[model samples]
Target chain A: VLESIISPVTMSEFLEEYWPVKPLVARGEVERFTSIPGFEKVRTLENVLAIYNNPVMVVGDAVIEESEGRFLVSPAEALEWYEKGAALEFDFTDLFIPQVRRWIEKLKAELRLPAGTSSKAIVYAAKNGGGFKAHFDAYTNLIFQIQGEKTWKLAKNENVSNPMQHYDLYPDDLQSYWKGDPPKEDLPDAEIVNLTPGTMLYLPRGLWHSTKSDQATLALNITFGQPAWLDLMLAALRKKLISDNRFRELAVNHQSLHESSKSELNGYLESLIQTLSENAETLTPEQIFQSQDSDFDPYQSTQLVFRQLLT
Target chain B: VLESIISPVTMSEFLEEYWPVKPLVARGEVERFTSIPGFEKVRTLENVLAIYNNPVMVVRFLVSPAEALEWYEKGAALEFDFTDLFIPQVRRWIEKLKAELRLPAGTSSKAIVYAAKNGGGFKAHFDAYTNLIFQIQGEKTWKLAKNENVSNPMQHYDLSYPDDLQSYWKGDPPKEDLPDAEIVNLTPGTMLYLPRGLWHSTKSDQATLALNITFGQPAWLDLMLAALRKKLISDNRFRELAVNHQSLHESSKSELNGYLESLIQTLSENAETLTPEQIFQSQDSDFDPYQSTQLVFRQLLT
Candidate 1:
């Protein structure tokens, strides 16, 4: 099924050389993605209202229909908002739609990812929309253009690579977060691409991109979690440290570190560093990989239950 | 605070010599664990019944505290789980230990309190987590066997006593028909450190209260999967299925195996480029205990 998504380039060659470094474009795969919600179906205001689910609706940068500190908008109200030029967003559609769920399951198997790997889908519907602001996500994204047309402006990411999950390229209040001048008016090396129905684009993590559409359009964005090398290393080390009683011993009065004990702490720190360095050499890739794979996360299942109820 | 836990041997020596390889027993530290639940404050039945937020179990079956106490009075072993959540001192103690160990963020330590009367005990079983069992009161005899599944240790697996338990228990138990095992008399003020996957069973001679502090270690598979996922998502080769449908032919299986071998070789070669600093930094960033609590609470609230 994914053969249609990457028609020209062979999967092997793409993995071997271009991935996470360069972008790829595949054309004429709109039919393969028709099962996704709001793709071929749910186009009209009446159809959107008939869906019955309350989804997030955003106008420009701010989310509307704020209640109890959360932005909750009903489909009927969302339809009205869409008519008034607001964009509709359905996040995590795979949780409800069986078609989307089946597609994701197949996609996970195709990618050879472990059962723990997480992916999320967001569908956006808009007409003459003020698209999302330029930003970089911490995860990789596959954008499939299901209907209409939109233009994208892309530039190389200036932020650090493999950023933390909570990190954002552009903070909510950019003026206060950024010390220097606002984003440059001209991106020195920017590429522009026009997307129409039957077009698909892949963007690796940490790529700065923004989109705008003068005509009505619908797109499905699938974001995949990509844990960094550091994440693995840390996960591995943590496993080893858990059973080590030395690591579990607290300092004498941890809440308050006295000047007298500071020297002792420094000596302890030096010894700890030496011990870690010695153990680092003994770590094998296989051991690290195995540790991460076999980890039993009961919390993740609980999270899925909450997602089922809330989203 | 931790010095009291490991009295006979130093923490450094324990890590170097005993951790994950063998078991260690530290004797006489009952007062050190008085702050934990069921040790001092939660000794009464009413006190245990009041903390309904925690899970109470009779043997394998989950039961309410009222029913569990009824079983306890009639001589059934009762385990009060997640006592750390109900007791602030237990939570603080776990947090202190995690911080001392420099454990990665998301690493968890839970407390399970066991109260048994009239020869109550558990059948042979193995846990995926490292357990520090503290005998709070009375005496309990323990029989432990080397784990046969050392190479592939899992989180949990069932093994009934006097049945198929010997299949997974490497050493012989005390009895002639039983498998080989190491027996220890766990008396008051004794703490035993049992590594993950060690087959063990316990029974109290009289009445007893034991607190099992379980540490959730990161699995090797999860770490590997995390690293592999990044590579998998970036590369399209991993995103395409090998065959068209459910089952594969023998020839196709061989072809897939060959491709997997090549992939492993590539991964090994790539892994050589990573630095020790990157590993250490990852471990530092991965640890955020509060964030883990927030995540769980968020899910519960949602």
Candidate 2:
């Protein structure tokens, strides 16, 4: 047995498995997925510098901004439908939304709303230029294939949980020795997900994964939810009146006094508590609407149908 | 009567009277001191920077980058002797070292040390203008200058015996709200030091009495002694290793613990039989030459 390699489901069966989530197959969902036509393309440093522009391609300091009107035309149409129909839309501009929407729809249909969802995409080129280096994302995500193919390698790490740890300085010995080899045991769990056009992969937050372009192709990714609990609680505590004094005394405080070693874990639980406490009373349907902002944003009408009803 | 100020002599007597230390100086004992000359001449950033060139400066900077040599030209000499050497040195440096050393020692001797013992000095500040301003519109009132003289500000803060209930703030307010001008009280017991070179005078309560006196310039030797005093206290083992006088213990380890752990152990073992002061007096008998040097120096200078 190859560790724990299992295909989640067939495209139609995955949708059928999730009902009331209404997973509908649009012919364009698979076809026009990679099909971006008539993209008015130009390159400029100024465009690249815009805060909205990220993962933008820069050809010698000239950035070629990605256009949703190009590759994301169908997703955009879906967004338009949801906006008009009072359905929440996820922020698909984030690379990981497609797979995240798919996971949420499946989760909703099964009546098992996941705590969160995520998506991953991979696009790579030749041997010398294929790697994306060893970087990890801060959110939980699922990797699914929409079009092109690529190979993904993953590693599990306890320390991989920190967003700051995304950038690391390797000692000279580790750099020289492990330049081409796999990472040592201290890193997160490792796995290689061979991505075909229809492959699906899921990763928990703090799981360290990176990719390379095996062939010159485009990759799509989706990030499913807001950051884990601790980051959220801190964000909440920062604005309170006593926050300054508390920060001066101790920068971070968490729920379990005994679990000092697990600051991140405590932070996560605290954040969830804050969210739940804030939402417990006086939560209107608007509360559900607000939850959809960061996590389930840019959700399309077709996606809503695919997730909530039309399977 | 103002509650805040103390005369210089009275302050000196207070330190002499209640010193919580062994005698550092034998009466009339003297020691020679040396320091860099022409210190004021090297006041420029470039000259101040030149200390980096010295090997000793390098060794000192590794542990404490803040300590820099202050050179006194030959003409700069003693201001006060035989009492509170460090504070007087500071006062003298402020009064004359600016003309002699080129570095402007603030009139208030406002040298803020970042750490205890040979810490690096703040670089010679030059060519910077900084200001703090507060504006209050309408019937605002400002009272300035209280408890002005500080003859002996503690090198370290004492939670108890703080000098004053209040100090001074500088400002004035609307004419309509002004009653009689507030009095700058300076009674006989009031401390009466002034910041150097500031050209201002004040109205005072009729009974207030203020007198101003300036110290003569500080020499390099004064600084060397202060620097040595700092060095002597930093020897950790002097405080850590306890004196051993008991004739019974033969081993060095036992002797090391004799005055600290063993003495305490033996005393506690015999607590039913001995008084507290007797135990303390017995421990004093083991005091030796090395342990007494700093005490000797402190008494001599203070």
Candidate 3:
């Protein structure tokens, strides 16, 4: 038997304040936010695939073209297929439907963001013969365990490897990587949660993890990926013809180049910090406003596939 | 002048036998098995790069290849590099050249391995750049210093982002990743240290960290890498598969990939007591025999 979950806020309120660190809403959060309407109906794999036109999801080393379809493409081919961008577009669109919008709104609200939070949704359903292997999402998310229970095993906090540094170690093996020899066993304080219907789990970005449902199950997740102030500043800096010289200056010198002197590097970093602090006001209440439609997009991005999202 | 860093062994040994009992090595053991040779010559980038070229010196992403030799070409043409085999080879050579295989060894020796969270040590701090970080399991230690510095603006043991999921939040304009946003902060992880050249610091001690070191120029000032490589040439393994671009590239790829996935899986899972479960259920011991090999190295170096 399963219970319907509920959250305090309507879809609008939830989207704005989801990420600022609030108390954990009960499992009922899922039920309260459940508002799937006027979008594709959720059902077993066959019906879902018919509606979505066989959009694929990444599962282990293969591409799941449909809810239960699988394609064992080479790493390069996988990268190529992902680069086409069609599959991701479908997944992105599917998430914005009414039910997903409400869930995203609730998660954002629980996280305590301004009332203008926005999110993108990705739904992974393992129907009769599909499951997402050990994997982590690319952005911040609220995973609502909507269907059958899934066993989620978590690595201890200490188990995370620094991907940036290791990639710097072996750049070519970007797609396939394993933990080092005599692998560090999981930590003593590791937490494992079996997510079932009416259960919602909040996950921050860049965490190392993997999950699988023992049997057929349906899962819905609303990823509330908001740009932090740090991100805004860096983006401002990234622009070449920035109207703001400060952004240009900081972005140009942010790299930890070998030639950079300790003092020079420190100065560059301090300047960046100063710029951030100076512009911190830009992250005002109005700017941080959350909106359900903020992450709404009918298309997927090509970069998502190119990046091989193993990040 | 920099002061000599004390060994974590006494603390580790005490902890291993006492409080927070576990059968595996205590979290903070810094037993210096044998001091690696050839530290004196590694002052500037040139010295470090040259030392890396020696067949016996296993370099990792700790230093870039271009930094090592202006001419040392890589098959992958990638950004960074790391290695674990060269140090032992260099150690063997150091022993033969010094002709002191019979000398008494010291209690101090160093080899990098995995350290779990809540294992040992003080609050999080920065390590010198010469070290390598490997995440075997658990989270990458929660590093807290804003930038690279000793006096972190954030207080030590600061719980700025205590929510286990807080570290993963992506800011807007997504492509621009924040600096030090806890990269892959999971276990079965590896990180490279270049000298504490920067002021980065960490927070929690609850990370499973693995590390490797380039021959420390200061610590091993008495030893010479050139001389050691010459002596190491006598070893059959060194001669059989000499350190070349192909071998080094392949070796690094395997190790880096192995540890990387481990890090990913660990962070994504974040299952409390998962490490304990895995360790207890595992059929094999996690301890690396290489650390034991250091015993032989201690005899040879002395």
Give the better candidate number (1 or 2) by TM-score.
Answer: 1
* Residue B254 lDDT in candidate 3: 62
Task: Summarize candidate 3's per-residue lDDT along A80-124 as a digit string, tens digits.
Answer: 444343122125434324555565555454444423234556556
lDDT of 1: 0.58
Per-residue CA lDDT of candidate 1, range A152-267, in tens? 87776554444333333343222222233334544436798888877888887666777777888887778666544334444455454434334433222222345686456556
Compute DockQ for each candidate against the true complex: 0.05, 0.01, 0.01
Which ranges of candidate 3 are over 4 A from the true structure?
A1-40, A58-90, A93-118, A127-138, A155-189, A206-208, A236-241, A244-311, B1-302
Cα deviation of B272 in candidate 1 (Å)? 18
**lDDT values, one for every candidate:** 0.58, 0.27, 0.33
Task: List, residue by residue over B1-302, the lDDT tens digit for candidate 3.
Answer: 00112233343453335211111121321322123343333222343334343212112222224432322222111111222232454455333321221111221124333222333322333331223333333454333223322211111222222221122222331112234444334333223332322223332244333443322211110111112222222322221100111222466546534443443233222212122122112212212223334333223222
Instruction: Give the candidate number with the greatest TM-score.
Output: 1
Question: Candidate 2 A-chain TM?
Answer: 0.38
RMSD of 1: 10.7
lDDT of 3 at B157: 24
Tens-place lDDT per residue, model 2, A1-311, is: 10111223443454245321212121223332222211001011122122122122111111123222111122323323322221111223323334333534544323222222233222211222243545554444544454355666666544422231133324321232222344553334556666665444555444555665544333333343323222221212222211122111111111212345545434443443343233222223222222321222112322322222111
